[PDB]
Amino acid sequence: EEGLDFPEYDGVDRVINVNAKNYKNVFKKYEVLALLYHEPPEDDKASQRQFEMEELILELAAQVLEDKGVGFGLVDSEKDAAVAKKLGLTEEDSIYVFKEDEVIEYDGEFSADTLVEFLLDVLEDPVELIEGERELQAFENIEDEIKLIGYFKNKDSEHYKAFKEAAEEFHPYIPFFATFDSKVAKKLTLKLNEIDFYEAFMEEPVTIPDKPNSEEEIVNFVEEHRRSTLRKLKPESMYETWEDDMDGIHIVAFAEEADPDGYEFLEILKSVAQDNTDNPDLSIIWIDPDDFPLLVPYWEKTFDIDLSAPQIGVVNVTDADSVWMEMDDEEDLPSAEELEDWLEDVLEGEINT
């Protein structure tokens, strides 16, 4: 016999050199197009190696997604300046994703797995319809991201169309769900044309006021409620989340969800978030170390902590200086009240913002 190999990177180049002469053709060919806006080659070996790596990561993603009609291209900030201008490419060494009439400024991990998962998400339709019990339960079980759900008469409702337009503005980062089924709406407690917004990790939704809602009303509401009290650092959005600091610091909690102590600590964090949900000055970033294996050594060294145990601290975004709460693993984890008390102590006397 033979034994067929697992798929492997084949070393065939698929990433397109996008330029003035071909960019129109390239957009016609692909339903989803990912473009890396990058700088011309520097004379130093290090920067050249960095670009070499990035381009190869794109090549791998390009091979994986070839059959699904996702295209990958490079736009040189000098050689292709006019193209960049026309497409709105501004952020140096950054990935932009195009689908129909939407442009996405990718602000996530530059890795093949993360990029492929993201682009697969981009390919999906912007609104998820709930009809069956399995789908409803799936909706209800989402906690680690903001989600919206609306009840409409049918797909031809002017108000469903507005909801879908809003959904496209945030696709694929914020899931929008709809139902046309009165029995599903009843379980969700939605009146016709009502839209419920669920903050991450919050049990109770907030209804968008003044229904029926225009596209703008929905987009306005989502933008105002973009930052959850507790938010998870996710590969797909990590840079956006981190760059959104609270007056120069982040409260950061490490917890491994799959670990007994990590799970318990997460439940405590959720309680803290719930009890402070209307405090616009509070945002905690939850990082599950299991999601970022390549950063664990760095974090353990930089923060001087053991990531096999739950941690909570405050980090200065300018220099990564930090302070972490002492917890004895021979004792029970701190209560939500204890955590809040500690945060108050640290943020009151050690913050001159």
Ligand X SMILES: *[C@@H]1O[C@H](CO)[C@@H](O[C@@H]2O[C@H](CO)[C@@H](O[C@@H]3O[C@H](CO)[C@@H](O)[C@H](O[C@H]4O[C@H](CO)[C@@H](O)[C@H](O)[C@@H]4O)[C@@H]3O)[C@H](O)[C@H]2NC(C)=O)[C@H](O)[C@H]1NC(C)=O
Question: With CB cut-offs between 5 and 8 Å by kind, which of ligand X, Na ion, Ca ion, none does residue 76 bind?
Answer: Ca ion
Residues 197-256 that bind Na ion (CB under 5 A): 248, 256
- Nearest approach in angstroms of CB 326 to ligand X is 20
Give the CA distances from residue 253 to residues 81, 144, 283, 347, in Å, rounded to whole numbers and listed in that order: 42, 14, 11, 15
Instruction: Find where tokens 């001087």 sit.
Output: 304
What is the C-alpha end-to-end distance of the chain, expressed in Å? 70
300: exposed, middle or buried (C-beta count within 10 Å: 0-12, 13-18, 19+)?
Answer: middle
User: Toward ligand X, which CB reaches closer, 88 or 248?
Assistant: 248
Question: With CB cut-offs between 5 and 8 Å by kind, which of Na ion, ligand X, Ca ion, none does residue 141 bind?
Answer: none
User: Toward ligand X, which CB reaches closer, 154 or 353?
Assistant: 353
User: Toward ligand X, which CB reaches closer, 48 or 316?
Assistant: 316
Q: Which residues bind ligand X (CB under 6 A)?
A: 248-249, 316, 318-319, 321, 353
The torsion angles phi and psi of 178, rounded to 5 degrees, stand at: -135, 155
Question: With CB cut-offs between 5 and 8 Å by kind, which of ligand X, Na ion, Ca ion, none does residue 353 bind?
Answer: ligand X
Residues 134-193 that bind Na ion (CB under 5 A): 172
User: What is the pairing mode between strands 32-38 and 322-324?
Assistant: unpaired
Helices (H), 130-214: 133-141, 158-170, 182-188
Apex CA 313: angle with CA 307 and CA 318, to 5°? 105
Q: How far apart are CA 2 and CA 23, in angstroms?
A: 44
- Nearest approach in angstroms of CB 5 to Ca ion is 26
Question: With CB cut-offs between 5 and 8 Å by kind, which of ligand X, Na ion, Ca ion, none does residue 256 bind?
Answer: Na ion
- Nearest approach in angstroms of CB 171 to Na ion is 8
The torsion angles phi and psi of 138, rounded to 5 degrees, stand at: -55, -45
Residues 6-25 that bind Na ion (CB under 5 A): none
Question: With CB cut-offs between 5 and 8 Å by kind, which of ligand X, Ca ion, Na ion, none does residue 41 bind?
Answer: none
Question: With CB cut-offs between 5 and 8 Å by kind, which of Ca ion, ligand X, Na ion, none does residue 59 bind?
Answer: none
Question: With CB cut-offs between 5 and 8 Å by kind, which of Na ion, ligand X, Ca ion, none does residue 258 bind?
Answer: Na ion
DSSP 325: -
Considering the rule CB under 5 A, would residue 353 count as an interface residue with Na ion?
A: no
DSSP secondary structure string, 32-100? EEEEEEEPPPPSSHHHHHHHHHHHHHHHHHHHHTTTTTEEEEEEETTTTHHHHHHHT--STTEEEEEET
Residues 253-272 that bind Na ion (CB under 5 A): 256-258
Q: Which residues bind Ca ion (CB under 5 A)?
A: 17-19, 74, 76, 80, 117-118, 121, 189, 210, 213, 229, 235-236, 277, 292
Note whether 118 and 107 are within 8 A (CB): no
Chain residues in the site for Na ion (CB under 5 A): 121, 172, 248, 256-258, 288, 290, 316-318
